[PDB]
């Protein structure tokens, strides 16, 4: 492939460099339209800018935490982090978010990796290997109430059991209701006067719930869960302007008030170098 | 107020004109539908799509 | 049940009206059924809110 | 003697002529078309009013003055009240449509000024409150009036800050969306053909707007000496290939 | 070799090697030739 | 096992079933069809909303009692407010349509009574004043309510005398018009298909009604002993092959 | 596979929507027996409702 | 590839792709045609 062809002096009536940008086109002008060039080859394919590659590496999408401790006398397991959940979503952590929102609709399979590490803040003894249970709780399923409810039987709901310190990995097909996931949605769930506006209404994907299977030892053990997400089989439509201001909320476009100028002011003139 | 054979019966009144016999929304996973076999199976899945057949037999 | 995803309503009204023969009286009832058309799709299995338990059963 | 410059668009019972055009943009290089069966889901036969809905509606005019910040209309909202297009809209459960948008602004060879005319698929607005305040319905359904970016923040309304496109992105990059400029010195109209863009084959026309049309002054209007300091901008829009489905009782929407 | 039955379980996809910027860079209705005048 | 007796008519998104029909009449043995070019005059392409206008609208119900004289509806008037049919009607300059009329009245094998259901092309009514008094507009445009032949003379209204068909002809000869009887002992519905009948290819839908549908009790209703002395009669009507042409601003009509 | 075929107006002596449930059958009635439909395809096989799948986790 | 000798040790079965509701939806002795009268 040639990156530049050889081109010499020109004295024409045919001027490729004068255009009318009002038309909305970006005319494909090249170095050889306005200087004299020599042949050179590309030596490159643009492999690593493919959208599959761009969205295809694992990104941290969520960090939560649960603890193993005596539940005796706990009136609210959920509240003691005896188990915890996560209202699945991919917009909470914002590094991966800016990348996805370069597109309007996106379609992909997900590969999740879950790393779980333990911490023993209060001076301790022997730690017996804890086994985490991650179970997917889709919309309209008995949400779990204690850390050892019938829910955890999970007879119809996919769940994975792995050890703290290890990693769990599995992959979920594209579960969207439509043909693509909306990265943006300028609509409502119905024409009410006070119903929420955005996507949050659209990406009702239910939540994920974690717990330790082990009963309690004499000390307490903090287990912190990190969920990583990798898109595989990516398809993206309609590019948009990149995010300039900071994010404030999952699912709304809102930016913070009295934010700071995002364009760097010159130290000098327009004329400055 | 307690489950009875009677909640399967939609009553009809002689001589009423213009009026309404019954009403329900179509949340097949809840409400009237929920205990029916259809309702009961739909509940093992997260998403549904398709046509429903609703019939009335007169007695 | 979800809003965005909601399916409508079903209602029934007298078109003309029920008329009973002589020597007859009172309410008459309709039985109503529901089943899915061959059209139907269900996907993404999960657990039913229709059954739960507090201790394991025994014999 | 055909120029890129003169054009005629006849759609239904209405025709537009421009003698000073700058080509026309067809979003994503695709022209509006009806919904194919292979893509269909709802089993209902759809209704295609054709020429009674696919004609040109001219919205009420705006006034560009030296202080203008820009205006924003949403589709199909802007047309919610135009003739039979609008009726069909409130009466069917689902509908789908593409449009021809023609923005008009003429001046003289002594004026200067340049407007950006851009179509943004799925333009989800931001609340000026920050945090996770929502933007109420009425605020994102201005109707033919559209939203005036130089109007004041209101409560439950969107933010109207132009350098941020009403969503946290910079004005400068709006050029990645199908758009055309109106530079008084070149141009006097802008025309964009919009194919139907959605993640579902057909949708509700009232709970979801699928494009915002935005006209933004970028090089300020400068009139000749002792000229009146303003020009009107007119927007005429025509639904094209419209289809409605799931007819019934007639939606009632807030406000 | 896929070891698994479902398609979601396969590795990343392979390069589009599609690449056609004209839907974005030249969505004009009447074709513009480089070198010919922009507005005739 | 097909009987003349059971029938199903599906039109648009609406279906009717009768288990006690008496065949169906198709006026003048012709079925509704669109307007051919060879017969066309107006050069405008017409709009054919199809399934959104060609469905069944059920008008409000009447009550047959022993004192009833008969009721009269005019078309397209009776439908002037039904869904998108009506909108189209007020919004185009010209329109054209055929209809399926289904009149319903069920009783039991102890009742007796017989209604005449007849369609009269161009039913010009008479003033009860005599002389050359006219019948004002409002009076001949009752809408879905229709005209109740047992209501009182009003001023500027038509005469409501049944033995004279509201025009100086005898009830007995209405049988020369497409018609069907509903005899409680036989029948429970009447169905008539009306092709478009006019002296022009397309006309105005508001200044001229082209058929009156008339339901007239002829053998008085007789209920079984100690039965309630009345039965409701319901009329459901569906425009078929409708076409509208000459779209614009939306007619404003008296009252 | 078609999920719905195209079907238009009907004025028949052949009524598929009237049945006798006393018989114990569920007659296979479809949208196209009572409204006007357009063609649409299924795009789906019913894979995840197989009893092997239902009892297999 | 089965690594084991016994049939019980193989993975899940594969979709019946059988599907015939008529034993459940139409177990009537004399065949009913849709459109023909239910009771003659
Ligand atoms: C946009 C957009 C895209 C996504 C991701 C959707 C992923 C589908 C649901 O995700 C899961 C997560 C976990 C599990 C799980 N099953 C057993 C253990 O974890 C299943 C599906 O979220 N927002």
PDB file of N, CA and C and ligand atoms in Angstrom, chain A residues 88-90 108 110 112 134-136 158-160 170 172-173 175 181 203 205 208 229, ligand 1:
ATOM      1  N   UNK A  88     -26.425  -3.921  38.574  1.00  0.00           N
ATOM      2  CA  UNK A  88     -25.570  -4.000  37.386  1.00  0.00           C
ATOM      3  C   UNK A  88     -25.743  -2.823  36.493  1.00  0.00           C
ATOM      4  N   UNK A  89     -24.649  -2.440  36.008  1.00  0.00           N
ATOM      5  CA  UNK A  89     -24.534  -1.201  35.233  1.00  0.00           C
ATOM      6  C   UNK A  89     -23.074  -1.030  34.831  1.00  0.00           C
ATOM      7  N   UNK A  90     -22.804  -0.276  33.821  1.00  0.00           N
ATOM      8  CA  UNK A  90     -21.426  -0.225  33.265  1.00  0.00           C
ATOM      9  C   UNK A  90     -20.901   1.191  33.177  1.00  0.00           C
ATOM     10  N   UNK A 108     -22.549  -6.157  22.192  1.00  0.00           N
ATOM     11  CA  UNK A 108     -21.391  -7.012  22.446  1.00  0.00           C
ATOM     12  C   UNK A 108     -21.721  -8.091  23.442  1.00  0.00           C
ATOM     13  N   UNK A 110     -20.307 -10.056  26.921  1.00  0.00           N
ATOM     14  CA  UNK A 110     -19.449  -9.586  28.000  1.00  0.00           C
ATOM     15  C   UNK A 110     -18.668 -10.725  28.544  1.00  0.00           C
ATOM     16  N   UNK A 112     -16.896 -11.409  32.088  1.00  0.00           N
ATOM     17  CA  UNK A 112     -16.614 -10.844  33.417  1.00  0.00           C
ATOM     18  C   UNK A 112     -15.453 -11.509  34.096  1.00  0.00           C
ATOM     19  N   UNK A 134     -21.248 -15.790  43.778  1.00  0.00           N
ATOM     20  CA  UNK A 134     -21.770 -14.689  42.971  1.00  0.00           C
ATOM     21  C   UNK A 134     -22.952 -15.201  42.165  1.00  0.00           C
ATOM     22  N   UNK A 135     -23.993 -14.380  42.712  1.00  0.00           N
ATOM     23  CA  UNK A 135     -25.065 -14.969  41.878  1.00  0.00           C
ATOM     24  C   UNK A 135     -25.845 -13.869  41.170  1.00  0.00           C
ATOM     25  N   UNK A 136     -26.254 -14.158  39.951  1.00  0.00           N
ATOM     26  CA  UNK A 136     -26.963 -13.167  39.110  1.00  0.00           C
ATOM     27  C   UNK A 136     -28.438 -13.173  39.451  1.00  0.00           C
ATOM     28  N   UNK A 158     -28.022 -18.509  37.295  1.00  0.00           N
ATOM     29  CA  UNK A 158     -26.601 -18.941  37.200  1.00  0.00           C
ATOM     30  C   UNK A 158     -25.827 -18.448  38.369  1.00  0.00           C
ATOM     31  N   UNK A 159     -25.106 -19.325  39.056  1.00  0.00           N
ATOM     32  CA  UNK A 159     -24.183 -18.688  40.146  1.00  0.00           C
ATOM     33  C   UNK A 159     -22.835 -19.345  40.066  1.00  0.00           C
ATOM     34  N   UNK A 160     -21.719 -18.691  40.399  1.00  0.00           N
ATOM     35  CA  UNK A 160     -20.392 -19.188  40.377  1.00  0.00           C
ATOM     36  C   UNK A 160     -19.835 -19.201  41.861  1.00  0.00           C
ATOM     37  N   UNK A 170     -16.418 -15.909  33.541  1.00  0.00           N
ATOM     38  CA  UNK A 170     -17.418 -16.558  32.735  1.00  0.00           C
ATOM     39  C   UNK A 170     -17.901 -15.550  31.762  1.00  0.00           C
ATOM     40  N   UNK A 172     -21.185 -13.676  29.347  1.00  0.00           N
ATOM     41  CA  UNK A 172     -22.728 -13.689  29.305  1.00  0.00           C
ATOM     42  C   UNK A 172     -22.966 -13.138  27.950  1.00  0.00           C
ATOM     43  N   UNK A 173     -23.910 -13.720  27.148  1.00  0.00           N
ATOM     44  CA  UNK A 173     -24.278 -13.268  25.829  1.00  0.00           C
ATOM     45  C   UNK A 173     -24.841 -11.861  25.900  1.00  0.00           C
ATOM     46  N   UNK A 175     -27.420  -9.564  26.559  1.00  0.00           N
ATOM     47  CA  UNK A 175     -28.709  -9.636  27.124  1.00  0.00           C
ATOM     48  C   UNK A 175     -29.633  -8.453  26.903  1.00  0.00           C
ATOM     49  N   UNK A 181     -27.552  -1.898  22.804  1.00  0.00           N
ATOM     50  CA  UNK A 181     -27.756  -1.224  24.117  1.00  0.00           C
ATOM     51  C   UNK A 181     -27.794   0.263  23.825  1.00  0.00           C
ATOM     52  N   UNK A 203     -31.918   0.563  30.708  1.00  0.00           N
ATOM     53  CA  UNK A 203     -30.954  -0.537  31.022  1.00  0.00           C
ATOM     54  C   UNK A 203     -31.290  -1.301  32.330  1.00  0.00           C
ATOM     55  N   UNK A 205     -31.279  -4.052  33.876  1.00  0.00           N
ATOM     56  CA  UNK A 205     -30.592  -5.334  33.706  1.00  0.00           C
ATOM     57  C   UNK A 205     -30.545  -6.149  34.999  1.00  0.00           C
ATOM     58  N   UNK A 208     -26.546  -7.994  40.518  1.00  0.00           N
ATOM     59  CA  UNK A 208     -25.645  -9.097  40.861  1.00  0.00           C
ATOM     60  C   UNK A 208     -25.455  -9.096  42.382  1.00  0.00           C
ATOM     61  N   UNK A 229     -14.841  -6.016  33.243  1.00  0.00           N
ATOM     62  CA  UNK A 229     -15.706  -6.348  32.096  1.00  0.00           C
ATOM     63  C   UNK A 229     -14.953  -6.158  30.801  1.00  0.00           C
TER      64      UNK A 229
HETATM   65  C1  LIG I   1     -24.876  -0.801  28.345  1.00  0.00           C
HETATM   66  C2  LIG I   1     -24.628  -1.943  29.268  1.00  0.00           C
HETATM   67  C3  LIG I   1     -24.111  -3.214  28.977  1.00  0.00           C
HETATM   68  C4  LIG I   1     -24.087  -3.878  30.140  1.00  0.00           C
HETATM   69  C5  LIG I   1     -23.681  -5.238  30.561  1.00  0.00           C
HETATM   70  C6  LIG I   1     -24.837  -6.228  30.538  1.00  0.00           C
HETATM   71  C7  LIG I   1     -24.436  -7.626  30.986  1.00  0.00           C
HETATM   72  C8  LIG I   1     -25.567  -8.604  31.115  1.00  0.00           C
HETATM   73  C9  LIG I   1     -25.855  -9.042  32.550  1.00  0.00           C
HETATM   74  O1  LIG I   1     -24.579  -9.242  33.221  1.00  0.00           O
HETATM   75  C10 LIG I   1     -24.353 -10.400  33.938  1.00  0.00           C
HETATM   76  C11 LIG I   1     -23.480 -10.277  35.019  1.00  0.00           C
HETATM   77  C12 LIG I   1     -23.184 -11.372  35.801  1.00  0.00           C
HETATM   78  C13 LIG I   1     -23.753 -12.622  35.520  1.00  0.00           C
HETATM   79  C14 LIG I   1     -23.419 -13.774  36.358  1.00  0.00           C
HETATM   80  N1  LIG I   1     -24.000 -15.081  36.271  1.00  0.00           N
HETATM   81  C15 LIG I   1     -23.486 -15.948  37.184  1.00  0.00           C
HETATM   82  C16 LIG I   1     -22.502 -15.011  37.858  1.00  0.00           C
HETATM   83  O2  LIG I   1     -22.534 -13.748  37.300  1.00  0.00           O
HETATM   84  C17 LIG I   1     -24.625 -12.736  34.441  1.00  0.00           C
HETATM   85  C18 LIG I   1     -24.925 -11.643  33.656  1.00  0.00           C
HETATM   86  O3  LIG I   1     -24.555  -3.071  31.115  1.00  0.00           O
HETATM   87  N2  LIG I   1     -24.898  -1.827  30.523  1.00  0.00           N
END
